[PDB]
Design an enzyme around this catalytic site. Structure first.
Site, PDB file in Angstrom:
ATOM      1  CG  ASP A 218      -1.759   1.480   1.417  1.00 16.27           C
ATOM      2  OD1 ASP A 218      -1.847   1.898   2.583  1.00 16.27           O
ATOM      3  OD2 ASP A 218      -2.354   1.703   0.202  1.00 16.27           O
ATOM      4  CE  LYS A 222      -2.167   5.175   0.160  1.00 14.92           C
ATOM      5  NZ  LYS A 222      -2.884   5.667   1.536  1.00 14.92           N
TER       6      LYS A 222
END
Ligand SMILES: NC(=O)c1ccc[n+]([C@@H]2O[C@H](COP(=O)([O-])OP(=O)(O)OC[C@H]3O[C@@H](n4cnc5c(N)ncnc54)[C@H](O)[C@@H]3O)[C@@H](O)[C@H]2O)c1
Ligand code: NA
Ligand code: NA
EC number: 1.1.1.3
Lengths: 358, 358
Positions: A218, A222
């Site tokens: 995750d 980003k």
């Protein structure tokens, strides 16, 4: 501009339904007509392009729909004929949908979304999304990193005026920020990593399976996004160093509930790593990092002095430290980096930026 | 085909000069034509509305002009004549120009500016910010509060989304942030308030007469703006508590430069307060404050713990802490809140928003 825009929503989950409530209650001089409310199974669709007649209770309309969601090639063949600019709001984490972005854009349909997929895959996909060829749809993805905080728009604005990013670092995971803010404080404490994790899981600050947070994917997606914005041509979420918190090869060996109880068997290392940091008067935090000079991007644990703003994060906030050619002293933005209402508002904010642009 | 927007600039000082450079250098899918530039008695006016032929050096071209600056009424008339939407960029701090804003806007001329005058006068003048008329240009003032940081756009965004601001507080003066950053520190300081100002004055980090920074009027100016955006109808920047730093009733005296030489006589009170805060592991900061529930706004000194974000500012940095219905924990935005480049980037940032909206 354009006092009338048509909004096509995909996703009615945790973020999606809050978004819908916010979109449908928003008062503006610009008219936003909802022409699609698609879920995995059922879907509401205005063949007319007239506002879906659901007042503010779309759930009963959607629940009562037996019309199957259209395959994206069919959805676009339809949306492209709208008499007013169309804005696709993708409130899912679908690789399938993301795989269709380029075709949406090429059909003059803009996109507002929190879906990290299309922005953290192919490098050519990325360039295609931000080409801005005439008539093509505009793509906004504010909520992909930092939920509703003003981060990506700020970076893009800055770069447009001529500023240049040099260094960025931040905590882009609400679950990992929470865990570390608990696991590593200024005060010396003998709290175990495994305890914090399962505690986070119980309080619900974790994905159903904590491993989806601890693997760093995750945070890696980003930073891939922020790095590319900064002008670092990151190949993929796995083309740079990404430190996973999932205990070594005892990883893809277990199965959910097994992983958890099996995790406590490793608090040793982190306990001793945290101790060495408590020696140097620092604390441990899980960060995403970008260095444009060295074209080096990375994810993992790094030590931070107690004074550093990263050591005083409240709750499970996210934070980004941005150093540019002009902002020699860092621009630091903190705040909730997750949460239904705040994340949906960032997407909505993006819908507003597109609506005025059309 | 290519969208075109004509830009009319008034003011080529420290900020305007950076603005002009950034403007002529920026590359975009929208074309921005500089069609007019005015500085003191010299103006460059493209009677053609084609881009001013400033070749490479716009400074040399400005200095060479023999075209006098147009009275504001004649300027408006001329601008109404442009073949494309016009954006006026007021890089002055003129209350006189500010006084003509209404005329500009009701005549379809948009505005982008660092000029706080018009936004911090009486309330009725501020109310004239809504496009009551469909032929009204837009008004953007991002750089009026916190230079180029994403503050005002972020506040307006979430509000539109349905969010509600409850509290706000920050350091809004670059000068005063610099001074208190030197004066009250975490690491056993010991400098006289008197000396911090004298040096900030020589470096030009304060108005020619620092009293214009110490009277706290400027932060009151920005607080009036933020508070209004937050739904608090502040009457004016003097209709609420504002703590002045000009030594007791010994301000309305000195011949100006006299002030600095006589200031070292009152370092006692602040030296005491300073010490006290240090004794408590706190630091002193000059802040602006707004409370929407109690409709209370104010500015003045407040103490903050060493780990508090308001204790991590550097040089001319400033910050804003925003508590909203959705953000129970404040989102905190910090970074340079003064400086040519960063401010000009804030203004251009608005010029770009307006252009896309036109
Ligand atoms: N949950 C958070 O706190 C948070 C914070 C930041 C970003 N996000 C992102 O926001 C997005 C929304 O997450 P969420 O929590 O609402 O997830 P969710 O699973 O609750 O909702 C996803 C929705 O997408 C629908 N969907 C999936 N595939 C579809 C398809 N092909 N066609 C139509 N509908 C489809 C599902 O039926 C569901 O209604 C994701 O991109 C997520 O990564 C979440
Ligand atoms: Na964001
Ligand atoms: Na600002």
């Amino acid at each position: 501009s354009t006092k009338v825009v048509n909004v096509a929503v995909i996703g009615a989950g945790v973020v999606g339904s809050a978004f819908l409530d916010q979109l449908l209650a928003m008062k503006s001089t610009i008219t936003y007509n909802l022409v699609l409310l698609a879920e995995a199974e059922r879907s509401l669709i205005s063949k007319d392009f007239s506002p879906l007649n659901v007042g503010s209770d779309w759930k009963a309309a959607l629940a009562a729909s037996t019309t199957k969601t259209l395959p994206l090639d069919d959805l676009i063949a339809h949306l492209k004929t709208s008499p007013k600019p169309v804005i696709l709001v993708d409130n899912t984490s679908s690789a399938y949908i993301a795989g269709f972005y380029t075709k949406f854009v090429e059909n003059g349909i803009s996109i507002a979304t929190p879906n990290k997929k299309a922005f953290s895959s192919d490098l050519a996909t990325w360039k295609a999304l931000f080409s801005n060829k005439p008539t093509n749809g505009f793509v906004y993805h504010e909520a992909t990193v930092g939920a509703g905080l003003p981060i990506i728009s700020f970076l893009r604005e800055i770069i447009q005026t001529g500023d240049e990013v040099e260094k960025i670092e931040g905590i882009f995971s609400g679950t990992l920020s929470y865990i570390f803010n608990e696991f590593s404080t200024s005060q010396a404490n003998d709290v175990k990593f495994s305890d914090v994790v399962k505690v986070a899981k119980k309080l619900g600050y974790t994905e159903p399976d904590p491993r989806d947070d601890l693997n760093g994917l995750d945070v890696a997606r980003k930073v891939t996004i922020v790095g590319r914005i900064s002008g670092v041509e990151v190949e993929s979420p796995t083309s740079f160093p990404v430190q996973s918190l999932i205990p070594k090869p005892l990883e893809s060996v277990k199965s959910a509930d097994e992983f958890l109880e099996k995790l406590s068997d490793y608090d040793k290392d982190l306990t001793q790593l945290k101790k060495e940091a408590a020696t140097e008067n620092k604390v441990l935090r899980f960060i995403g990092k970008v260095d444009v000079a060295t074209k080096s991007v990375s994810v993992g644990i790094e030590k931070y002095d107690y004074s550093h703003p990263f050591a005083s994060l409240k709750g499970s906030d996210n934070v980004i430290s941005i150093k540019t050619k002009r902002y020699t002293n860092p621009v630091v933005i903190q705040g909730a980096g997750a949460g239904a209402a705040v994340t949906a508002a960032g997407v909505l904010g993006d819908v507003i930026k597109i609506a005025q642009r059309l």
